[PDB]
DNA sequence: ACGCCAGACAGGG
RNA sequence: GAGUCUGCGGCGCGCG
DNA sequence: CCCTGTCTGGCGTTCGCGCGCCG
């Protein structure tokens, strides 16, 4: 039950703090019994989100709780419901138990109300998990807010009403994986809880009582309140999150500033201005490109890398320990016994790497020297040493190196020596050495980004601002999303955010559309109408009218059915803009793209790059002690699994040797992999497979049991798997 | 690396933030089907719109000559 | 150097248990802390299973590959790597017999079906708890002639 | 895709046999010296860092290019198992 | 040859294109086709960007008729209510009738929306994607422009109130919650089907892995006849099986015997191409052929393996199957993928000989049928003036055979699913096999999957690679042993060594799982069932695992008995005219003195 | 019997059960030699008998546990040989390749079914031994050990090494795998075209064979070592040669969702407005009038006009 | 918790 | 003329 | 003593990859 706090981004941690699991003591619910439990039962209303549950085998069983849901006295998730005696609604609320809720006739919040009076004779209400059209006279209780129906996590989706629940889920879960960008911007379109999340979560630092500001350090903000007191508020400069993300508090208050009680003094890891912010608001064209956005691929404008727009600081904490071997203590020094000084520059402090030093894959982070053999020296290594220089340090290089993949700059270092202050050093552990490395993760092709609705995908190509889709005015788009990924999935919500986002771009305003009660299609068309004066209005005054391009697309457009034939291009373009679509030129050819294409400000986040991302390619390396199959860990990537599902795939094909190869030379054939390597170094023809150790290990396992497994020849006679170690003496 | 502890920064070398062109119909006495190209260029200040335009036309001309020696 | 064309599971003869066997583990002595070395004859002794080290021996009379297939005159250590230690088998000589659970608790009791006994309950009855048998001849009575194969108790015995 | 795979497929009785052939031919191409080919002169294998593929890039890429010609001979039992490796070392130099 | 195989008379759909690839594959050659693919790939992609197709909120267009059909159906709902408030309709009737009102009204809005796009917006972004093989689903479109109307409760009983909204307009607070229940069961369902889809691929492989093509045209000509017509959709009316289905049965097959149809002479052993199977259908149309004699794995002679003439065409390539192709797996796989889309529970009941939920009493006797009227239990009797096979048909069972006509052995005397064991007893094995096959295809068909019968046959064969003994020779009577191993016994006991000790056996039907559990080698058995049991027995009896089959021979890390390890091609030498002469010079030197 | 941390030692649970048996057999030997009171002899032979089960198979009858720490059945020999992740299953599925790799996939539009974009950085490790030798064939490195050290650090790679790799992969191909390997096309062979970065470029048309879209799916990569394995891998396992599916004789290289949208759009015919007569089929005044009426606003370029709408008359 | 197969024993002639 | 030894079982979560 | 029926006894339950923790 207790696990690592998922603090990818504060919202994540907050979510991992309140979610409800089924599996546990074992007394409650087991794992192969679940179809009944997994479903979203009727009573889960306002008590459990129907959306927050995970996709996968453990479905419907592990889930975070709802909005106002609160455990009362004994584990019964209750929920708020306002009272309504007669046709009058109160501002009074009763957190009701799941059982008590059944006894009453509760109504929805959407019910037209003039204050305390219901306003429509036949208004909706739900008796007991049964939708029922009740009269204002029977309305005993009313819902607090549509919010309560879902969790915090989901409440963050702009037009959740227009998104299929199955994808909404993926949208909720995605927020929990958002990574803190140096530049945090709040969505151009919000739900209403972004403020609350950063506040109830402990991201930003708020002002206790009213006062003025004294000092504004990059490290501390000591305010002076009006009651005659003054406090110094340190700020977690740069701290290592569990998940390796940056947690910095950036002061937003200037020196000598009268602050209101409960005002942001500093912004949390991912807040803009007290608002929750993960990933950034980018202009986006929703059209297809060559094949760069095929099934779920995304095209990124190099321009986004120019201004550090998707950049993330990452901290990986490599660590090494000076163990005490009965062969001689493992020393930690600048001495790397065998080959170069060029690899010992960065290692400036004797042993430790210097701070602010660029560490690339394969560089020494920390040096260490242990002893060469198990117990004895070497007869063949004794001659080599003596030939060029007998007096060769017998100590072996076992130094903490940068594991393949990446390192960055060394920012902090920690060393616990002999006379420990108040630390717990494990036995054998002479001393420890932590090395904190940080690195800016500019957005690259490997990375994956996704919007709050569910559209997930990876970056296929970083196009030069030179030729990607550009608007009538020089402003080019940042990302180009593939339309095809919207029909199949059902999330028009994204198409709605982009429209509203379009208006905000030329109207210069951010918005807040509640969950079920937010903005409406008519209201957005209205704002876009305002946007048209911003966009085309300055165009008229600046000195120019419509393009041949702009007119051509219009023809094709009216022939399509997007503009009422017979109106003036000025009036026509407006009608087309209101549609949420504008004219765009290719950027490569300068010719327009036949047919209006929508564009807008869609909030998109970058996802956490696990060590799963940082690709694993393995040539040769470690092997397991009992099973002789390939394995890695620290620096040697580790072999991929070939699975029977895949064996069959090759079985199907006439791939005989390719399969033999997988089962012998590449994984288990001890003598084979060896001869294999050597042969390839030579440019020779690999030898022919010797028996695999798994078989050998199996026969004996089977021999451990009374059973006798003997291999046989043409005529049923012996043959020998174990080359000669089984005969006795 | 001027100083060993200095930190490099990302390079942004385009003196132009955005370019825009429109092709509106223009009248020449005899035939009405004609093009008029007006391109608006914005610059950070380092260089001027005119200076940029000229350099631009030059890079295009320099590339048009690369069609000289067949093979 | 031949190709393995047929594999075959067969029951093990006690003599065969000994034949594949190298040494007998006769004491519960894993490894004595002071020296991470195998304690006594125990479960990890190297005679019974194999060279704790590379090509080298015990004491060190012969230490390389030139004499790979010969044993030390004073100490018996033939050596390849420590693999000879991971392929060899050891046997334990039990006092009074016990049976394979694989053969006695499989749905159809291979011994229960073969031996006409209560397929599943008579077995469990005398295997784990208390009931005794007469092998060749026992001229005197219980009340009836000697039981050639039947079983008697300690009290009437 | 690859050069005349259809042609290739058509020259054998069974798909998986062609594979055996091409593989066993690339082997011999390396082993007894890489000059053991049947069509080097005018048009032949080529790579472009230089035109150097003429010496040792891919083995079977050649085997294929040869088998696509009617020079080689692949049978179930064409030439007695051991006498082939003897006469092949006798006549082909490169080591 | 490019205009010979293309249709420029219609917009290029995924199917028109699908068919252009296939044609191009057969006509011009493999690699040349690959060229065509990339070509389409390149232009499809380019034209795509330029086309400017994009989803817009307004692009999803709501029919003006939605308002009507909803109101029309709304008022009708009141009529159903007023009709119950009087006491005319039973509590149930009310419900079932209301469902039917929406079930139809929703489908009504469906065709309506499309009708709008078809007549007024042919080039609608959302629409065109759906029409083009691109992206979209008729049911999905509806949820955006039309309305997603009925979402069932937790249990399964659909809700009485529909979801009057579309995704275009605000799906309300509750309609969302209501619809949530279904999404959750869907996600739980998908999770348990994925596990069971991989398991089915494991079991199919456990029994068909050994099946590999290693042959010479097996000479035992006992073939299967691919029916082209189906019996009861409507009681009794003969009909031409679906184009799809029939194609699935005769495409790329090898005729067992010569058939003269509409004028052409389809020779024996000829592999009928898709065009040929188009011919036979057109002929059945005219009325010249009711069946089709065709070789099939169901009747191969090769004990362990299947030959070229029996399997057929389909290698990954369109020509006959190359000897040395792992068919067992290839079959096991083609069945295990589509499964994840299914439903599946039946497919399991089918591969595993079982007694399904709704059993149907099969007529063990073939005579005619007759029914009775007494109170409690009804009764369907297959009778003769000699005897009747009493078939107890309780209250809930719906019998469709009537008082009067004939009923062959193993014929449905009750309605629903059937028990393989009984059907085996009544109508025989040649009937079980064909039952299983068709009854399995029934599910994938109904789900869009199009898999060739070849595969389900390969598998089902193995379900019956075993039989019981009733007249001994070598070993005692009651025994379940390998069918072909008896064909061996009986063959040499009558042919080579005299004394006709007929080995009378009984066809035994077993499920994929039990055939794998209980097979010859143990290595294979040690893999799934109970390693514990499998080994026990295999030990007792010193069992020599003769390595044949890919499962057992993979464990050893030895070469695959199938593939290149194919004894057919494991040995093949290559020559240069230069070494051909040199070896001949070696023969010439053989002349002594 | 291994050294874990600080002094912690881990030994396979089999030993705890072996101790059990040894101890009991011994104590029994001693209990029979000392003096034998029936009750105590049986009481032990029982425990003895149970012990013997323990190593063979634990759980058939009761389940032995390591003392208060983990109520876990000590993995008995049967357990080691059986199940999903057991010993018989480790053999059959042989699970871990030496020359393997895996990364996130990303669409490679220009790529031809024939090839796949593989990260050079990934290649370097993948084809390392093949590269080492090639280093020596050239002047970049004196010997293998040399060539290895040359590559143990990322800032030490001369641009010449990439030339060498690019050269070593010339005509060799690699296999690609997808999350669930459902059919034979679950794995396909392609020609690696070295590319920059993390992601692996995959061809769009094959995206149908392996159930794979680009929201983050990751595909594994292996390398055929033998000249035999490579042969088969590029002859009968490459992508471009396995176009039809083993299930149905229908293609699997069918244009996907993106391709078809494009190829459709281009081939469709449009229809617009018929208010005035649509009969050019017969009158010659119908050609004139409906051709001038089109020039006007009345007849569209695509009118329901049987034989030819004015759109055909004009051009 | 479940589902399924195979099993050994006990009740009614 | 380099090669040893460690990373297991399970648990939790997340992607596909 | 036979055949039939009922509880009874033993086994099984996608695949791959990340990360992190623990004796
Ligand atoms: Mg995906
Ligand atoms: Zn010695
Ligand atoms: Zn056959």
F66 close to F43: Cβ distance less than 8 angstroms: no
Give the end-to-end CA distance of chain F in Å, rounded to a whole number: 89
CATH of the domain spanning A80-144:
2.30.150.10
Q: Do C101 and F48 touch (CB under 8 A)?
A: no
CB A123 within 8 A of CB A172: no
Residue E182's SS3 state is: helix
CB of C112 lies under 7 Å from some atom of strand G:
yes
How many whole angstroms from C3 Cα to the centroid of ligand 3?
Answer: 30
Nearest to E328, CA basis, from A229, A651, A585, A720: A651
How many angstroms separate the CA of A671 from the C1' of H1?
A: 19
Contact D31 A654 (CB under 8 A): no
The answer to whether the annotation marks C62 as part of a ligand binding site is: no
Contact yes or no for E148/E163 (Cβ under 8 A): yes
Asked if F235 lies within 8 A of D19 by C-beta distance, the reply is yes
Instruction: State both tokens at A250.
Output: 């950036």
CB contact under 8 A, A708 and C12: yes
Ligand 3 ion: Cβ-proximal residues, 5 Å cutoff: E 218, 300, 307, 310
For residues A451 and A607, the answer to whether their CB atoms sit within 8 Å is no
Closest CA–CA distance from residue C3 to any residue of chain E (Å): 9
To the nearest whole Å, the CA of F67 is away from the closest chain A CA by 20
C-alpha to C-alpha distance for E577 and F55, rounded to whole angstroms? 65
Rounded distance in angstroms from the CA atom of residue A3 to the C1' atom of nucleotide I22: 12
C-alpha–C-alpha distance, residues A648 and A662, integer Å? 12
Phi and psi torsions of A459, nearest 5°:
-80, 120
How many helices, marked H, and strands, marked E, lie in chain B? 1, 2
Distances (CA, A) of A591 to A471, A547, A560, E51, E213: 11, 11, 19, 13, 58
Establish whether C115 is an annotated binding residue. no
Contact criterion met (CB < 8 Å) for E540 and C8:
no
For tokens 């003094």, name the residue. A265
> Which nucleotide's C1' atom has the smallest distance to the CA of A634?
H7
Cα Rg of chain D, angstroms? 14
3-class DSSP state of E554: helix
Fold for the domain defined by A278-310+443-607: 2.40.270
Tokens of F11: 């030994």
The rounded distance, in Å, linking the Cα atoms of E418 and E408 is 15
Chains E and B are in contact, defined as 3 or more C-beta pairs closer than 8 angstroms: no
Q: Is nucleic acid strand H under 7 Å from A56's C-beta?
A: yes
Helix or strand (DSSP H, E) at A57:
none
The answer to whether the C-beta of E514 is closer than 7 A to strand G is yes
Any atom of strand G under 7 A from CB of C71?
Answer: no
Contact yes or no for A474 and B35 at CB 8 A = no
Is F240 in contact with F115 (CB distance < 8 Å)? no
d(CA A443, CA E324): 49
| Nearest by Cα to F92 from A398, C62, E531 | E531
What was the resolution (in A) of this experimentally determined structure? 2.5
H or E, element range at A316? strand A313-322
Q: Nearest residue (Cα to C1') for G3?
A: A32
How many distinct structural domains can be found in chain D?
1
Q: Are D81 and E577 contacting, i.e. CB atoms less than 8 angstroms apart?
A: no
D2 min Cα distance to partner chain F (Å)? 8
With vertex at residue E471, the alpha carbon angle to CA E468 and CA E472, rounded to the nearest 5 degrees, is 90
| E strands present in A518-659 | 581-582, 597-606, 616-618
Return phi, psi of residue D70, to 5°. -95, 40
- To 10 degrees, the CA torsion angle through A203, A205, A208, A209? -130
Q: Which residue is nearest to nucleotide I17 (CA to C1')?
A: A612
| CA–CA distance, F157 with C56 (Å, rounded to integer) | 41
Query: Which residue spans within A392-440 are E strands per DSSP?
Result: 395-397, 400-401, 409-416, 431-440
Q: For strand I, which nucleotides have at least one atom less than 7 Å from a protein CB? A: 9-21, 23
Q: Which helix (H) or strand (E) holds E16?
A: helix E14-28
What DSSP designation does E376 have?
Answer: S
CA-based nearest distance C98→chain E, Å: 17
List beta partners, residue A480.
A285, A299
Considering only CA atoms, which of F264, D23, D72 is closest in space to residue E53? F264
Contact between C31 and C38 (Cβ < 8 Å) = yes
Backbone angles phi, psi at A534, to 5 degrees: -70, -50
Residues sharing a CB contact under 8 Å with residue E211, sequence separation 6 or more, in sequence order:
E297, E304, E305, E306, E327, E328, E331, E458, E462
What is the distance between the alpha carbons of residues A196 and A190, in angstroms, rounded to a whole number? 12
Q: What's the order of all strands across the beta sheet hosting A205-206?
A: A205-206, A264-267, A250-251
Query: CA F42 to CA F37: how far, in whole Å?
Result: 9
DSSP state of E191: H
How many other CB atoms sit within 10 Å of the CB of residue A80? Answer: 17
Closest ligand to C-alpha of residue E298 is 3
Residues of C with a Cβ under 8 Å from any A Cβ are: 2-12, 16-17, 19-20, 22, 36, 53, 56, 63-64, 71, 78, 80, 83-84, 87-89, 100, 102
Question: What do you get for the CA distance between the two ends of chain A, in Å?
Answer: 54
Q: How far is the CA of C30 from the centre of ligand 2 (A)?
A: 22
3-state helix/strand/coil string of chain F: CEECCCCCEECCCHHHHHHHHHHHHHHHHHHHHHCCCHHHHHHHHHHHHHHHHHHHCCCCCCCCECCCCCCCECCCHHHHHCCCCCCHHHHHCCCECCCEEEEEEEECCCCCCCEEECEHHHHHHHCHHHHHHHHHHCCCCCCHHHHHHHHCCHHHCCHHHHHHHHHHCCCCCEEEECCCCCCHHHEEEEEECCECCCCEEECCHHHCCCCCCCCCCEEEEECCCCHHHHHHHHHCCECCCCCECCCCCCECCCCCHHHHHHHHHHHCCCCCCCCCCCCCCCCCHHHHHHHHHHHCCCCCCCCCCCCCCHHHHHC
Ligand-binding site membership of E145 (annotated): no
Residue C24 C-alpha to ligand 2 middle, in angstroms? 20
Which residue pairs from E128-131 have beta carbons closer than 8 angstroms and sit at least 24 positions apart in sequence?
A: E128/E53, E128/F261, E128/F264, E128/F265, E128/F268, E129/A483, E129/A484, E129/A487, E129/E53, E129/E55, E129/F257, E129/F261, E130/A487, E131/E11, E131/E13, E131/F264
| Chain F residues 168 to 207 with C-beta below 7 Å from nucleic strand H | 179-180
Question: What are the residues facing E506 on neighbouring strands?
Answer: E468
| Chain F residue numbers touching C94 (CB-CB < 8 A) | 25, 48, 52
CATH assignment at residue D71: 3.90.940.10
Contact E43, E17 (CB under 8 A): no
d(CA A438, CA A435): 10
SS3 A234: strand
For residues A108 and A46, give the distance between their C-alpha atoms in angstroms, rounded to a whole number. Answer: 12
Nearest chain F alpha carbon to E522: F88
Q: Which of A119, A116, A108, A97 is nearest to A147 (CA)?
A: A108
Q: How far is CA E166 from the centre of its chain?
A: 36
* Pick from E60, E136, E191: CB nearest A57: E191
- Three-state DSSP class for residue E266: strand
∠E172-E175-E176 over CA atoms, to 5°? Answer: 80
Nearest to E540 among C6, C7, C110 (CB): C110
Q: Map tokens 């050269």 to a residue.
A: F167
A622 strand H contact, CB < 7 Å: yes
Nearest to A472 by CA among A545, A413, A407: A545
Q: Burial letters for A433-466: b for 16+ Cβ neighbours within 10 Å, e otherwise? A: bebbbbbebebbbbbbbbbbbbbbbbbbbbbebe
Q: What is the least distance, in Å, from the CA of A333 to any CA of chain B?
A: 23
Measured distance CA(E141)–CA(E94) in Å, rounded = 30
φ, ψ at E442 (rounded to 5°): -50, -40
Chain A partners of C47 at a C-beta cutoff of 8 Å? none
**Angle, vertex CA E73, rays to CA E70 and CA E74, nearest 5:** 80
Fold equal for A80-144 and A278-310+443-607: no
User: Fold for domain F98-241?
Assistant: Barwin-like endoglucanases (2.40.40)
**What is the token pair recorded at A376?**
């004895």
Which whole-number Å values give the CA distances from E71 to A293, E101, E102, E105, in the listed order?
A: 43, 12, 12, 10
Assign 3-class secondary structure to A627-662.
Answer: CCCECCCCCCCCCCECCHHHHHHHHHCCCHHHHHHH
**Torsion region of C149: left, alpha or beta (phi above 0 gives left; psi -120 to 50 gives alpha):** alpha
Q: How far apart are CA A309 and CA B10, in angstroms?
A: 12
CB A298 within 8 A of CB A310: no
- Nearest Cβ partner of F231 from D1, D53, D60? D60
Q: How far apart are CA E509 and CA E353, in angstroms?
A: 7
Angle, vertex CA E485, rays to CA E484 and CA E489, nearest 5: 110
d(C-alpha F303, C-alpha F311), whole Å? 8
Structure tokens that stand for E229 in this block: 């017509």
Q: Which residues contact C90 (CB under 8 A, 6 or more apart)?
A: C21, C22, C23, C24, C25, C48, C49
For residue A259, give the DSSP letter.
B
Q: Does A476 touch chain B (CB under 8 A)?
A: yes
Structural domain containing residue D29? 1-95
CATH topology of domain A311-442: OB fold (Dihydrolipoamide Acetyltransferase, E2P) (2.40.50)
Cβ pair D19:F232 closer than 8 A? yes
Report the side by side order of strands in the sheet with A220-225: A211-216, A220-225, A230-234
Residues in chain D: 95
* Nucleotide whose C1' lies closest to the alpha carbon of residue A244: I19
Residues 6+ apart with CB under 8 A from A625: F2
Which CATH number is correct for A204-268, 2.30.30.30, 2.40.50.100, 3.10.290.10, 2.60.40.3620? 2.40.50.100
């Amino acid at each position: 039950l207790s696990q690592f706090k998922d603090e990818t981004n504060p919202l994540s941690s907050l979510r991992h703090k309140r979610r409800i699991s089924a599996l546990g003591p074992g007394g409650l619910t087991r794992e192969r019994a679940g179809f009944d439990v997994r479903d979203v039962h009727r009573t889960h209303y306002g008590r459990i989100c129907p959306v927050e549950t995970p996709e996968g085998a453990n479905i419907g069983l592990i889930t975070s709780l709802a909005a106002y849901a609160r455990v009362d006295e004994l584990g019964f998730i209750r929920t708020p419901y306002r009272r309504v005696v007669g046709g009058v609604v109160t501002d009074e609320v009763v957190y009701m138990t799941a059982t008590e809720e059944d006894r009453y006739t509760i109504a929805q919040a959407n019910t037209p109300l003039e204050g305390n009076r219901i306003a429509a004779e036949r208004v909706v209400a739900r008796r007991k998990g049964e939708p029922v059209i009740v009269s204002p006279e029977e309305v005993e209780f009313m819902d607090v807010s549509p919010k309560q129906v879902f969790s915090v996590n989901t409440n963050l989706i702009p037009f959740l009403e227009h998104d299929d629940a199955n994808r909404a889920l993926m949208g909720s879960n995605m927020q929990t994986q958002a990574v803190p960008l140096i530049r945090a911007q709040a969505p151009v379109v919000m739900t209403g809880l972004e403020e609350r999340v950063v506040r109830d979560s402990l991201a930003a630092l708020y002002a206790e009582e009213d006062g003025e500001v004294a000092k504004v350090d990059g490290n501390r903000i000591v305010v002076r309140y009006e009651d005659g007191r003054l406090v110094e508020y340190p700020l977690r400069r740069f701290y290592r999150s569990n998940q390796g993300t940056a947690l910095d508090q950036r002061p937003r208050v200037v020196v000598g500033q009268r602050v209101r009680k409960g005002d942001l003094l500093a912004d949390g890891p991912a807040s803009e201005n007290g608002f929750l912010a993960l990933g950034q608001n980018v202009l986006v064209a929703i059209m297809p490109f060559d094949g760069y956005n095929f099934e779920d691929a995304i095209v990124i404008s190099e321009e986004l890398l120019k201004r550090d727009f998707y950049t993330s600081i990452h901290i990986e904490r490599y660590e090494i320990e000076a163990r005490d071997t009965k062969l001689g203590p493992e020393r930690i020094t600048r001495d790397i016994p065998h080959l170069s000084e060029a690899a010992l520059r960065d290692l400036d402090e004797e042993g430790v790497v210097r701070i602010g030093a660029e560490v690339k894959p394969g560089d020494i982070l920390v040096g260490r020297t242990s002893f060469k053999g198990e117990s004895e020296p070497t007869p063949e290594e004794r001659l080599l040493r003596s030939i060029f220089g007998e007096k060769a340090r017998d100590v072996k290089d076992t130094s903490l190196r940068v594991p393949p993949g990446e390192g960055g700059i060394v920012v902090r270092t920690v060393r616990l020596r002999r006379g420990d202050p108040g630390v717990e050093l494990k036995p054998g552990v002479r001393e420890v050495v932590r090395v904190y490395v940080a690195q800016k993760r500019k957005l690259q092709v490997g990375d994956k980004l996704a919007n709050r609705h569910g559209n997930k995908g990876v970056v296929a190509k970083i196009l030069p601002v030179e030729d990607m889709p550009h608007l009538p005015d020089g402003t080019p788009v940042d990302v180009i999303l593939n339309p095809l990924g919207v029909p199949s999935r059902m999330n028009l919500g994204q198409i709605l955010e982009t429209h509203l986002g379009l208006a905000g771009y030329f109207l210069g305003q951010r918005y807040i559309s509640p969950i079920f009660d937010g903005a409406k299609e008519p209201e957005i068309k209205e704002l876009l109408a305002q946007a048209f004066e911003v966009y085309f209005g300055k165009r008229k005054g600046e000195g120019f009218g419509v393009d041949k391009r702009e007119v051509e697309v219009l023809r094709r457009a009216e022939k399509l059915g997007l503009v009422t034939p017979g109106k003036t291009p000025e009036e026509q373009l407006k009608e087309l803009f209101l549609q949420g679509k504008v004219v765009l030129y290719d950027g490569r050819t300068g010719e327009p793209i036949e047919g209006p294409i929508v564009v807008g400000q869609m909030f998109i986040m970058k996802l956490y790059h696990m060590v799963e991302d940082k690709m694993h390619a393995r040539s040769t390396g470690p092997y397991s002690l009992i099973t002789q199959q390939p394995l890695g860990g620290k620096a040697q990537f580790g072999g991929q699994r070939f699975g029977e599902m895949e064996v069959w795939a090759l079985e199907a094909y006439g791939a005989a040797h390719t399969l033999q190869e997988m089962l012998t030379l590449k994984s288990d054939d001890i003598e084979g992999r060896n001869a294999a390597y050597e042969a390839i170094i030579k440019g020779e023809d690999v030898p022919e497979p010797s028996v695999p150790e798994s078989f050998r290990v199996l026969v004996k396992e089977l021999q451990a049991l009374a059973l006798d497994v003997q291999t046989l020849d043409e005529k049923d006679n012996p043959v020998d798997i174990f080359e000669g170690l089984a005969s006795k003496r | 690396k001027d100083r060993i502890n200095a930190i490099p920064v990302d390079a942004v070398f385009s003196p132009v933030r955005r370019v825009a062109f429109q092709v509106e119909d223009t009248r020449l006495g005899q035939r009405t089907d004609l093009d008029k190209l007006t391109l608006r260029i914005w610059t950070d200040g380092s260089v001027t719109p005119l200076e940029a335009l000229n350099q631009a036309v030059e890079i295009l001309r320099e590339h048009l000559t690369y069609f000289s020696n067949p093979q | 150097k031949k190709e393995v064309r047929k594999v075959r599971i067969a029951l093990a003869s006690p003599e065969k248990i000994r034949s594949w066997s190298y040494g007998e583990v006769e004491k519960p002595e894993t490894i004595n802390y002071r020296t991470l070395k195998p304690e006594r004859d125990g479960l990890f002794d190297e005679r019974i299973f194999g060279p704790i080290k590379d090509y080298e021996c015990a004491c060190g009379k012969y230490k390389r590959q030139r004499f790979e297939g010969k044993v030390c005159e004073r100490c018996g250590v033939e050596v390849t790597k420590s693999i000879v230690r991971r392929y060899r088998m050891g046997h334990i000589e039990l006092a009074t017999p016990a049976a394979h659970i694989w053969f006695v608790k499989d749905v159809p009791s291979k011994i229960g079906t073969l031996l006409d006994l209560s397929a599943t309950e008579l077995e469990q009855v005398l295997y784990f708890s208390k009931y005794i048998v007469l092998d060749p001849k026992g001229a005197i009575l219980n009340g009836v002639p000697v039981e050639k194969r039947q079983l008697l108790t300690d009290e009437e015995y | 895709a690859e050069p005349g795979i259809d042609k290739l497929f058509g020259m054998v009785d069974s798909k998986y046999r062609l594979t055996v052939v091409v593989a066993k031919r690339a082997q011999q191409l390396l082993r007894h010296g890489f000059k053991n080919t049947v069509l080097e002169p005018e048009e032949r294998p080529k790579m472009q860092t230089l035109e150097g593929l003429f010496d040792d890039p891919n083995a079977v890429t050649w085997a294929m290019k040869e088998l696509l010609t009617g020079r080689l001979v692949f049978g179930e039992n064409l030439v007695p198992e051991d006498r082939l490796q003897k006469e092949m070392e006798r006549l082909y130099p490169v080591e | 040859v490019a205009w010979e195989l293309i249709q420029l008379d219609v917009p290029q759909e995924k199917n028109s294109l699908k068919d252009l690839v296939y044609q191009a594959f057969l006509r011009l050659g493999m690699e040349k086709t690959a060229r065509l693919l990339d070509a389409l790939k390149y232009y499809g992609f380019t034209f795509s960007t330029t086309s400017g197709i994009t989803i817009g909120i307004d692009d999803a267009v709501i029919p003006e008729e939605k308002k009507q059909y909803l109101e029309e159906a709304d008022r009708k709902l009141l009529q159903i209510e007023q009709a119950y408030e009087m006491g005319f309709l039973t509590d149930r009737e009310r419900y079932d009738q209301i469902l039917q009102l929406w079930t139809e009204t929703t489908e009504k809005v469906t065709q309506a929306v499309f009708k709008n796009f078809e007549e007024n917006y042919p080039f609608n972004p959302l629409y065109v994607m759906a029409q083009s093989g691109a992206r979209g689903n008729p049911q999905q479109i509806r949820q955006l422009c039309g309305l997603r109307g009925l979402m069932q409760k937790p249990s399964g009983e659909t809700f009485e109130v529909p979801v009057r909204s579309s995704f275009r307009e605000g799906l309300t607070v509750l309609e969302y919650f209501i619809s949530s229940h279904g999404a959750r069961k869907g996600g739980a369902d998908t999770a348990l089907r994925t596990a069971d889809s991989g398991y089915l691929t494991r079991k199919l492989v456990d029994v068909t892995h050994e099946i590999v093509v290693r042959e010479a045209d097996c000479g035992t000509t006992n073939y299967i006849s691919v029916p082209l017509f189906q019996p009861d959709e409507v009681t009794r009316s003969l009909r031409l099986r679906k184009r799809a289905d029939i194609e699935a049965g005769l495409y790329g097959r090898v005729l067992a015997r010569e058939v003269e149809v509409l004028g052409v002479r389809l020779e024996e052993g000829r592999y009928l191409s898709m065009d040929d199977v188009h011919l036979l259908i057109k002929a059945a149309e005219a009325g010249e052929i009711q069946e089709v004699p065709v070789r099939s794995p169901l009747t191969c002679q090769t004990r362990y393996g299947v030959c070229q003439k029996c399997y057929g065409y389909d290698l990954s390539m369109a020509r006959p199957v190359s000897i040395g192709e792992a068919v067992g797996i290839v079959a096991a796989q083609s069945i295990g993928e589509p499964g994840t889309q299914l439903g599946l529970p039946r497919v399991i009941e089918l591969f595993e000989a079982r007694r399904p939920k709704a059993k149907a009493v099969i007529s063990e006797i073939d005579g005619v049928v007759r029914i009775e009227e007494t109170e409690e239990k009804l009764s369907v009797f297959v009778e003769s003036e000699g005897f009747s096979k009493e078939y107890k048909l309780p209250k809930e069972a719906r019998l469709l055979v009537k008082d009067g006509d004939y009923v062959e052995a193993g014929q449905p005397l009750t309605r629903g699913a059937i028990d393989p064991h009984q059907l085996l007893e009544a109508k025989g094995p040649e009937a079980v096999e064909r039952y299983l096959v068709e009854e399995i295809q029934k599910v994938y068909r109904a789900q869009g999957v199009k898999l060739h019968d070849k595969h389900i046959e390969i598998v089902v064969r193995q379900m019956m690679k075993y039989v019981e003994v009733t007249d001994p020779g070598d070993s005692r009577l009651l025994e379940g042993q390998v069918l072909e191993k008896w064909d061996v016994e009986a063959l040499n006991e009558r042919l080579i060594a005299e004394g006709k000790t007929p080995v009378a056996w009984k066809p035994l039907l077993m499920g994929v799982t039990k055939s794998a559990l209980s097979t010859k080698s143990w290595l294979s058995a040690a893999s799934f069932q109970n390693t514990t049991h499998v080994l026990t027995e295999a030990a007792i009896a010193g069992k020599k695992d003769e390595l044949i089959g890919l499962k057992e021979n993979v464990i050893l890390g030895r070469l695959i008995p199938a593939g290149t390890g194919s004894d057919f091609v494991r040995f093949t030498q290559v020559v240069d005219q230069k070494t051909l002469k040199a070896i001949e010079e070696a023969r010439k030197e053989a002349v002594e003195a | 019997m291994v050294q874990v941390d600080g002094g912690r030692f881990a030994t396979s649970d089999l030993n705890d059960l072996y101790r059990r048996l040894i101890n009991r057999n011994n104590r029994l030997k001693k209990l029979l030699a000392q003096g034998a009171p029936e009750i105590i002899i049986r009481n032990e032979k029982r425990m003895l008998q149970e012990a013997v089960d323990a190593l063979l198979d634990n759980g058939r009858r009761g389940a032995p546990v390591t003392n208060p720490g983990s109520d876990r059945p000590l993995r008995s020999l049967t357990d080691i040989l059986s199940g999903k992740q057991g010993r018989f299953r480790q053999n059959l599925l042989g699970k871990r390749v030496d020359y393997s790799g895996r990364s996130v996939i990303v669409v490679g539009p220009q790529l031809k079914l024939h090839q796949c974009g593989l990260p050079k950085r990934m290649a370097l490790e993948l084809f390392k031994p093949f590269l080492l030798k090639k280093m020596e064939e050239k002047g970049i490195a004196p010997n293998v050990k040399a060539a290895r050290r040359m590559l143990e650090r990322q800032r030490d790679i001369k641009d010449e090494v990439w030339d060498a790799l690019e050269e070593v992969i010339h005509g060799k191909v690699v296999l690609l795998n997808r999350a669930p390997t459902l059919h034979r096309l679950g794995i396909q062979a392609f020609q690696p075209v070295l590319v920059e970065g993390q992601s692996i470029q995959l061809h769009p048309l094959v995206c149908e064979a392996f159930n794979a879209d680009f929201d983050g799916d990751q595909m594994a990569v292996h390398v055929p070592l033998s000249s035999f394995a490579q042969a088969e891998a590029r002859i009968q396992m490459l992508s471009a040669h396995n176009l039809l599916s083993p299930a149905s004789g229908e293609p699997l290289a069918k244009p996907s969702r993106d391709i078809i949208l494009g190829l459709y759009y281009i081939t469709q015919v449009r229809k617009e407005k018929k208010g005035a007569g649509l009969e050019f089929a017969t009158p010659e005044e119908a050609l004139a009038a409906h051709e001038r009426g089109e020039v006007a606003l009345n007849a569209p370029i695509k009118v329901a006009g049987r034989e030819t709408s004015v759109g055909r008359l004009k051009y």
